[PDB]
Design a protein around this ligand. Sequence first.
Ligand SMILES: [Zn+2]
Ligand SMILES: [Zn+2]
Length: 45
Amino acid sequence: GKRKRCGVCEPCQQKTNCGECTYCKNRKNSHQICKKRKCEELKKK
DNA sequence: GCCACCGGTGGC
DNA sequence: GCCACCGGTGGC
Ligand SMILES: [Zn+2]
Ligand SMILES: [Zn+2]
């Protein structure tokens, strides 16, 4: 295996959740990070 | 065929 | 136990 976030992309440097995406609005049930914090390198295969 | 997203689970 | 990657696929 599993890749780790890069830690330096703009999403990785975000310090707070966007509060408006589907994953933010469903935080208590979602297994997914805020769409605005998802690492740009993890979006690539 | 695309892609948002469910949910199993690896890594800590 | 929590976080959130990632395989698979429902819904389009
Ligand atoms: Zn968000
Ligand atoms: Zn990153």
